[model samples]
Target: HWGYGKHNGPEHWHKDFPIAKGERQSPVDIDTHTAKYDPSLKPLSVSYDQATSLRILNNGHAFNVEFDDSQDKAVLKGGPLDGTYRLIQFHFHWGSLDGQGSEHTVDKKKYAAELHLVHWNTKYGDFGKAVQQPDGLAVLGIFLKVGSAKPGLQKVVDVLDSIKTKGKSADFTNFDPRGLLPESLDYWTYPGSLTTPPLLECVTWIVLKEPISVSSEQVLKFRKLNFNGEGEPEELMVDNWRPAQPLKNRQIKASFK
Candidate 1:
């Protein structure tokens, strides 16, 4: 299985997954000075129902909050997207240490962590089908800074204890993903792939410019998550993020001036 270890890390992924070296890869550095700002980009329209949240699990890769996207209960529209995209899950990527975990960097600056809200185009019918198409996925990326504790995020942190090991999951409901977003919807958009294996080139990346705050203690809790389950030797679930890929011929479109 592919992991962020010295032996099976990002550099070795291309051996098994050829697409790992494909163009339109994700986690790129956004050069704000070079990014094209277009006033025509529409404001993002996000509607997340707290009830749509189902469960939180540790998949050995990261902790994910899966959603019930059977209907359009929670969806994202506008903001460089052509149609509606339903929320499927949300996850986080952080480092073992503070101030160096975010996958996407801006002006050569990396944040302490990052939050990813995964959505698939409703036009494609479902997430599985959408993942195979060009304009299939749309991920909302929010940078996490180390500062005052985020009260809205405490709900998620509280569950880390229950799912400390891989393959562990617990029922988690009535939590609104909207509470995790920053005040500003300003973002940078581009075509990219999933950071993990089977790195499909189907995502429309929307990385927010504003960062949310998380306390030092909260970050420590994140590092405490285990990558291995019960019997296996415990591997700390930190620094699981992929390195930034080449920009190639892609252009970054900014929603703000």
Candidate 2:
């Protein structure tokens, strides 16, 4: 199975999925020294609807908060994206420890966790088809630094108990995911792929330079969620993040200097 275990983890992923070594694999280490500020890059604009939130699920990899993507109730525009993108779902990645969890790092600095708000370009019909296009998806990445309480995340943390085991889920509604984002939208934009397996090279990654705060206790609550299913041997869902990939022939552009 494609898991983060010693025997069948990321290192062995390439043996099954050849595209693991693809040119634009994701969760890259962002070297600020080389990322040039682009004046042409427009400010990111987004509108989210709390009503669109559907439910939260633990897929054994990472927990995801899915939304009603049937219509454009919530959408992302401007920035590196050319067309309107509809919000589909958002998920998270973290390490076992508080020091190193985020997927994308700035100047090799790691944050406690990372949030990914995934969107699909409306130009494409749906997420399944969109995933096949180079410019089909846009993923906004927010880094989580441990500090004061972030009330925005409490809504998610509160539901963790209901989904303690893999393949478990519960209703999660009326939550505006924008609350989890940092105040400043300044970000580094680049071309990358899905951090997880199948590693499709179709994502336009917009990683916010600013980080949002996350309380220590809240993170601990997440760690308590199990990676294994109810009947399987117990394993905590930690270090689910993929290691940084090579930046080969790619440019990371900044929205602000």
Candidate 3:
């Protein structure tokens, strides 16, 4: 459980929750102009047909779904990434309110929220072993902009009424998340660490330039979810996103085609 005030929160998370430091983080600003472009990197080739076994989990932060290898297209193709990666789990980060809700920031600019699709390399043969290896992970980042109404997201928010209480999650069935893809598939690629604890620097980041739009109402539903387990009824966890960190000589690549 996350402690309150000086005892917990972001500042204390690293120390009190040392493992949080090693968590792979995201939401780095993408300055394509300054990046050293790699022509060989193809960003939007994920195959969902192979991702058949889907598991929806609400781990308090946000509602996420995990897909098995048989249901993933990227794993089936062996992934464009260097190692053999397999689909493991995916989650979202949002704000306390609708205005802001992304995990990674670019120069302090926050989006409504962001969704992360996490995968581990197959060389390790399983998700459990991949987390220990630096090159064991690959994550796809997609931003959700608040503007037009989105019917696709309602499928997720509708279930919020069930997990409205803290630490409460219900089993989900017959849901395929591929329908949430944005119309524009253009994206930028780079190597970075996870945004949360553990902050491991082994992730191959793929952030889409085109953001999917949703309504402020939909965003609010996400914020209403519980942040702590005490049932304190804290404000929605909107704007749970973290600002973009310094690239520190890391390369950010893009694929327009």
Candidate 2, 222-249: lDDT as tens digits? 8898999998989999988888889999
| TM-score to true structure, per model | 0.98, 0.98, 0.83
TM-score of 1: 0.98
Worst 10 residues of 1 by lDDT: 45-54
Give a tens-digit lDDT track for model 1, residues 17-72. Answer: 99988889988999999999988888998888543888999999999999999987
Cα-based lDDT at residue 43, candidate 3: 48
Q: At residue 168, what lDDT does model 2 achieve?
A: 99
**Model 3, global lDDT:** 0.65
lDDT of 3 by residue, 160-257 (tens): 77776556666665556576678776677777777765566667877777788888888877777765554575645444555565566566666763
What's the CA error at residue 81 for candidate 2, in Å? 0.8
Residue 112's lDDT in candidate 3: 77
Residue ranges of candidate 3 with Cα displaced over 4 Å: 1-7, 16-25, 69-80, 106-108, 230-235
For each candidate, the alpha-carbon lDDT, in order, equals 0.92, 0.91, 0.65
Candidate 1: where are CA atoms >4 Å away? none
